[PDB]
Amino acid sequence: MKVLVVGSGGREHALLWKAAQSPRVKRLYAAPGNAGMEALAELVPWNGDVEALADWALAEGIDLTLVGPEAPLVEGIADAFQARGLLLFGPTQKAAMIEGSKAFAKGLMERYGIPTARYRVFREPLEALAYLEEVGVPVVVKDSGLAAGKGVTVAFDLHQAKQAVANILNRAEGGEVVVEEYLEGEEATVLALTDGETILPLLPSQDHKRLLDGDQGPMTGGMGAVAPYPMDEATLRRVEEEILGPLVRGLRAEGVVYRGVVYAGLMLTREGPKVLEFNARFGDPEAQALLPLLENDLVELALRVAEGRLAGTRLSWKEGAAACVVLAAPGYPESPRKGIPLHVPEPPEGVLVFHAGTRREGGRLVSAGGRVLNVVGLGRDLKEALERAYAYIPQVGFPGAVYRRDIGRRALAR
C-alpha cells in the first residue's frame, strides 16, 4: 500500500515513521518532507498547490494520504482529493474552517455551554470599559484588527487595561478590540480522533508554547512536548463530556462531516478545564511525543476515521512516557538564521530523533527553517524520558541551537 504524509516538520517525519511500522504499507511519500524523511519515503517537491498534489497522487497510485499541517486543510486538500476519489485523513475545508473559527467556538459556549475562556468583542470604548469591570484583572486586550498574536496585552491594571483598548480605538480610525478573561491554571493539550459520530481522545499532552525557559519570551509554535501529561481521570472525563462530545454535536449542526484530528488546547482551572482554541490536526511537537506511545497501526487507525468506523476501535498505548525537545535555529521564531551546518549522530536506545527543518546542500546536512531538530526521550518514566533526551542533545552538532531546558518541568511537578 502507498501512503502520503503532507508536511515538512517533525510531526510529519513522526507520522511518516509510525506509518512504516504498518505491514500493509509498501511505499511511503513525503510532500514535501525534508532531508530527515528521505530515509522512510520518497520526497515529493510539492509547491503547495492542492489540486496539483491530488492529481499527482492519483497518477502515482496513492492509497491513503495523512495531512500534517493545518493550511492544506483550510485550503481544501481533502476536498481536492475526494474529487479525485482518494482517501485523505483530514477534515474538508468547510469543516476545518468552521471547527477552527472563534465564531463557532462561541456558538458552542452559547448553545452547548462549552466551558471556554469568557471573552467578548467591541468596536466602541464605552462598551468595552463596562466589560472590564465585569471580568477583572489580569485581563487580555488584543488588537482584533490584527488577527496575529501581536498587539496583545496582559494587563494587571484597570488602569493599563483601558489604556490598552483606548489605544487601539484611537489610532486614527482603526476599529476592533478583543477583551478576554485571563484564566489561572496550567495549560494542557487534549488531542482527539473523530469521524463525525465517535470522538476518541488520545493521551493528554502538554506543549511548551514559550520560546524561553520559564515559559518566557515570544510565543512560538511549540518548543517541546511531553506525554502523557499527568491529568486526573475525572478531568479527562470532564473534557470529553463537556468539551469533546459537544464539539461533535455542534459540528454536525453546522451541516458538515468532520473526519480527522481535533486539537483542543486548554487551561485547567479550579472551575474546571476550559478550551482556549480548537485546531484540526495533530499539533507540533504534540505529535512527536504521542506517536511513539501509540499501539494501533496508524494506517488502520486512519482508515477508520476517514471511512467513519472509529466506533469499532480502542486506542492502546505503551506503558511509559515520551518527551520531545525542539532544537530551533538561532533567530527563531522572528528571523531564523538558516544554513547552520549541523551533524546528528545515531541516538542511543531510548532516544528518537526527528527532523523538523533540515536540508542537504550536497552530501552534508544543514538547517532549514525555524525549528530544526527533534530529540524525543523514551522512558517508562517521565524523568527517564527527559533524562535520556537531555542526555543526548549535547551530542548533536547544532552550534547556536536554541532549546529550552525546562521542557517537562511543569509536568514532573505532577
mmCIF file of N, CA and C in Angstrom, residues 28-87:
data_model
loop_
_atom_site.group_PDB
_atom_site.id
_atom_site.type_symbol
_atom_site.label_atom_id
_atom_site.label_comp_id
_atom_site.label_asym_id
_atom_site.label_seq_id
_atom_site.Cartn_x
_atom_site.Cartn_y
_atom_site.Cartn_z
ATOM 1 N N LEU A 28 6.198 4.719 0.907
ATOM 2 C CA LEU A 28 5.813 5.956 1.572
ATOM 3 C C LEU A 28 6.285 7.185 0.795
ATOM 4 N N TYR A 29 5.511 8.273 0.858
ATOM 5 C CA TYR A 29 5.868 9.510 0.160
ATOM 6 C C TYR A 29 5.727 10.768 1.018
ATOM 7 N N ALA A 30 6.791 11.567 1.087
ATOM 8 C CA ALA A 30 6.753 12.800 1.876
ATOM 9 C C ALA A 30 6.669 14.062 1.027
ATOM 10 N N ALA A 31 5.549 14.775 1.148
ATOM 11 C CA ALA A 31 5.333 16.019 0.409
ATOM 12 C C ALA A 31 5.163 17.231 1.320
ATOM 13 N N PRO A 32 6.202 18.068 1.425
ATOM 14 C CA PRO A 32 7.480 17.888 0.735
ATOM 15 C C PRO A 32 8.483 17.170 1.630
ATOM 16 N N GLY A 33 8.118 16.991 2.895
ATOM 17 C CA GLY A 33 9.014 16.325 3.816
ATOM 18 C C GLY A 33 10.319 17.096 3.977
ATOM 19 N N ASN A 34 11.400 16.382 4.290
ATOM 20 C CA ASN A 34 12.707 17.005 4.477
ATOM 21 C C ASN A 34 13.830 15.984 4.489
ATOM 22 N N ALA A 35 15.062 16.483 4.494
ATOM 23 C CA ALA A 35 16.262 15.649 4.487
ATOM 24 C C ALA A 35 16.203 14.465 5.441
ATOM 25 N N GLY A 36 15.460 14.617 6.530
ATOM 26 C CA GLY A 36 15.357 13.544 7.501
ATOM 27 C C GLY A 36 14.398 12.452 7.086
ATOM 28 N N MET A 37 13.304 12.834 6.439
ATOM 29 C CA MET A 37 12.302 11.876 5.995
ATOM 30 C C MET A 37 12.735 11.036 4.783
ATOM 31 N N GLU A 38 13.841 11.425 4.143
ATOM 32 C CA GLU A 38 14.361 10.709 2.969
ATOM 33 C C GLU A 38 14.668 9.246 3.265
ATOM 34 N N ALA A 39 14.805 8.924 4.547
ATOM 35 C CA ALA A 39 15.126 7.572 4.972
ATOM 36 C C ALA A 39 13.906 6.679 5.164
ATOM 37 N N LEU A 40 12.713 7.209 4.909
ATOM 38 C CA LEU A 40 11.488 6.426 5.062
ATOM 39 C C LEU A 40 10.556 6.589 3.867
ATOM 40 N N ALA A 41 10.733 7.677 3.121
ATOM 41 C CA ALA A 41 9.880 7.955 1.968
ATOM 42 C C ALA A 41 10.587 8.701 0.859
ATOM 43 N N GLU A 42 9.940 8.711 -0.296
ATOM 44 C CA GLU A 42 10.474 9.389 -1.459
ATOM 45 C C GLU A 42 9.946 10.809 -1.381
ATOM 46 N N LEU A 43 10.852 11.767 -1.259
ATOM 47 C CA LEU A 43 10.460 13.166 -1.180
ATOM 48 C C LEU A 43 9.738 13.673 -2.436
ATOM 49 N N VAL A 44 8.613 14.355 -2.230
ATOM 50 C CA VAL A 44 7.829 14.918 -3.331
ATOM 51 C C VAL A 44 7.893 16.445 -3.200
ATOM 52 N N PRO A 45 8.582 17.110 -4.143
ATOM 53 C CA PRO A 45 8.787 18.564 -4.201
ATOM 54 C C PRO A 45 7.531 19.396 -4.443
ATOM 55 N N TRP A 46 6.564 19.242 -3.550
ATOM 56 C CA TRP A 46 5.296 19.944 -3.647
ATOM 57 C C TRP A 46 5.460 21.453 -3.613
ATOM 58 N N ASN A 47 4.617 22.154 -4.363
ATOM 59 C CA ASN A 47 4.685 23.608 -4.409
ATOM 60 C C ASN A 47 3.554 24.247 -3.602
ATOM 61 N N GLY A 48 2.757 23.411 -2.938
ATOM 62 C CA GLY A 48 1.660 23.914 -2.124
ATOM 63 C C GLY A 48 0.324 23.875 -2.834
ATOM 64 N N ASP A 49 0.376 23.721 -4.155
ATOM 65 C CA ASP A 49 -0.835 23.661 -4.962
ATOM 66 C C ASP A 49 -1.558 22.396 -4.542
ATOM 67 N N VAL A 50 -2.779 22.551 -4.056
ATOM 68 C CA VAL A 50 -3.564 21.422 -3.592
ATOM 69 C C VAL A 50 -4.010 20.470 -4.698
ATOM 70 N N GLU A 51 -4.782 20.958 -5.662
ATOM 71 C CA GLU A 51 -5.266 20.083 -6.722
ATOM 72 C C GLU A 51 -4.118 19.438 -7.496
ATOM 73 N N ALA A 52 -2.983 20.120 -7.555
ATOM 74 C CA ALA A 52 -1.835 19.578 -8.260
ATOM 75 C C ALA A 52 -1.450 18.303 -7.548
ATOM 76 N N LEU A 53 -1.219 18.404 -6.242
ATOM 77 C CA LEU A 53 -0.841 17.238 -5.459
ATOM 78 C C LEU A 53 -1.870 16.126 -5.664
ATOM 79 N N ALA A 54 -3.149 16.466 -5.554
ATOM 80 C CA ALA A 54 -4.197 15.471 -5.757
ATOM 81 C C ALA A 54 -3.889 14.709 -7.045
ATOM 82 N N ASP A 55 -3.886 15.424 -8.163
ATOM 83 C CA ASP A 55 -3.606 14.799 -9.439
ATOM 84 C C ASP A 55 -2.367 13.931 -9.392
ATOM 85 N N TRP A 56 -1.282 14.437 -8.820
ATOM 86 C CA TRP A 56 -0.056 13.648 -8.731
ATOM 87 C C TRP A 56 -0.319 12.328 -8.026
ATOM 88 N N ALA A 57 -0.950 12.420 -6.861
ATOM 89 C CA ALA A 57 -1.262 11.249 -6.064
ATOM 90 C C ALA A 57 -2.089 10.288 -6.889
ATOM 91 N N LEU A 58 -3.071 10.821 -7.599
ATOM 92 C CA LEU A 58 -3.902 9.977 -8.426
ATOM 93 C C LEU A 58 -2.974 9.225 -9.384
ATOM 94 N N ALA A 59 -2.181 9.986 -10.130
ATOM 95 C CA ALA A 59 -1.259 9.404 -11.087
ATOM 96 C C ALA A 59 -0.350 8.373 -10.428
ATOM 97 N N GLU A 60 0.241 8.743 -9.297
ATOM 98 C CA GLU A 60 1.160 7.861 -8.578
ATOM 99 C C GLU A 60 0.525 6.609 -7.975
ATOM 100 N N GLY A 61 -0.788 6.634 -7.771
ATOM 101 C CA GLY A 61 -1.470 5.485 -7.193
ATOM 102 C C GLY A 61 -1.448 5.455 -5.670
ATOM 103 N N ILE A 62 -1.540 6.630 -5.046
ATOM 104 C CA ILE A 62 -1.540 6.764 -3.590
ATOM 105 C C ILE A 62 -2.855 6.208 -3.041
ATOM 106 N N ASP A 63 -2.788 5.484 -1.924
ATOM 107 C CA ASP A 63 -3.978 4.879 -1.328
ATOM 108 C C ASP A 63 -4.513 5.571 -0.073
ATOM 109 N N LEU A 64 -3.641 6.255 0.652
ATOM 110 C CA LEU A 64 -4.080 6.975 1.835
ATOM 111 C C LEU A 64 -3.100 8.102 2.061
ATOM 112 N N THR A 65 -3.642 9.297 2.268
ATOM 113 C CA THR A 65 -2.837 10.479 2.498
ATOM 114 C C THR A 65 -3.152 11.018 3.882
ATOM 115 N N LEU A 66 -2.106 11.215 4.678
ATOM 116 C CA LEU A 66 -2.232 11.751 6.028
ATOM 117 C C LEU A 66 -1.747 13.206 6.004
ATOM 118 N N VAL A 67 -2.622 14.136 6.356
ATOM 119 C CA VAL A 67 -2.246 15.540 6.338
ATOM 120 C C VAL A 67 -1.744 15.973 7.692
ATOM 121 N N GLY A 68 -0.553 16.565 7.704
ATOM 122 C CA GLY A 68 0.063 17.027 8.936
ATOM 123 C C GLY A 68 -0.276 18.459 9.305
ATOM 124 N N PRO A 69 0.257 19.458 8.580
ATOM 125 C CA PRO A 69 -0.023 20.864 8.880
ATOM 126 C C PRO A 69 -1.488 21.220 8.679
ATOM 127 N N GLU A 70 -1.847 22.427 9.113
ATOM 128 C CA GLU A 70 -3.217 22.932 9.045
ATOM 129 C C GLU A 70 -3.655 23.577 7.730
ATOM 130 N N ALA A 71 -2.850 24.504 7.226
ATOM 131 C CA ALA A 71 -3.172 25.220 5.991
ATOM 132 C C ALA A 71 -3.729 24.374 4.838
ATOM 133 N N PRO A 72 -3.124 23.204 4.566
ATOM 134 C CA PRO A 72 -3.656 22.396 3.466
ATOM 135 C C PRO A 72 -5.131 22.067 3.656
ATOM 136 N N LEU A 73 -5.540 21.902 4.909
ATOM 137 C CA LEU A 73 -6.923 21.572 5.205
ATOM 138 C C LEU A 73 -7.859 22.767 5.002
ATOM 139 N N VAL A 74 -7.454 23.941 5.468
ATOM 140 C CA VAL A 74 -8.309 25.106 5.295
ATOM 141 C C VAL A 74 -8.290 25.488 3.821
ATOM 142 N N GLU A 75 -7.263 25.008 3.123
ATOM 143 C CA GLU A 75 -7.140 25.281 1.702
ATOM 144 C C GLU A 75 -7.831 24.217 0.864
ATOM 145 N N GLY A 76 -8.514 23.294 1.538
ATOM 146 C CA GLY A 76 -9.272 22.261 0.851
ATOM 147 C C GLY A 76 -8.603 21.035 0.258
ATOM 148 N N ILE A 77 -7.453 20.639 0.801
ATOM 149 C CA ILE A 77 -6.744 19.462 0.297
ATOM 150 C C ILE A 77 -7.669 18.244 0.313
ATOM 151 N N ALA A 78 -8.383 18.038 1.414
ATOM 152 C CA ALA A 78 -9.303 16.908 1.499
ATOM 153 C C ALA A 78 -10.270 17.040 0.331
ATOM 154 N N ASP A 79 -10.887 18.211 0.230
ATOM 155 C CA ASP A 79 -11.833 18.475 -0.832
ATOM 156 C C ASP A 79 -11.281 18.086 -2.198
ATOM 157 N N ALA A 80 -10.066 18.532 -2.491
ATOM 158 C CA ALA A 80 -9.465 18.224 -3.776
ATOM 159 C C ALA A 80 -9.214 16.728 -3.976
ATOM 160 N N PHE A 81 -8.772 16.042 -2.931
ATOM 161 C CA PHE A 81 -8.505 14.617 -3.053
ATOM 162 C C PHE A 81 -9.764 13.772 -3.281
ATOM 163 N N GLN A 82 -10.799 14.011 -2.483
ATOM 164 C CA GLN A 82 -12.035 13.266 -2.636
ATOM 165 C C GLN A 82 -12.512 13.355 -4.079
ATOM 166 N N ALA A 83 -12.384 14.545 -4.662
ATOM 167 C CA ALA A 83 -12.810 14.776 -6.037
ATOM 168 C C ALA A 83 -12.117 13.805 -6.967
ATOM 169 N N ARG A 84 -10.880 13.458 -6.626
ATOM 170 C CA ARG A 84 -10.092 12.521 -7.412
ATOM 171 C C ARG A 84 -10.388 11.090 -6.959
ATOM 172 N N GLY A 85 -11.205 10.947 -5.923
ATOM 173 C CA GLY A 85 -11.530 9.625 -5.420
ATOM 174 C C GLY A 85 -10.447 9.035 -4.528
ATOM 175 N N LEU A 86 -9.735 9.877 -3.787
ATOM 176 C CA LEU A 86 -8.671 9.384 -2.925
ATOM 177 C C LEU A 86 -8.972 9.470 -1.435
ATOM 178 N N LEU A 87 -8.382 8.555 -0.667
ATOM 179 C CA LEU A 87 -8.582 8.517 0.779
ATOM 180 C C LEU A 87 -7.612 9.462 1.452
#
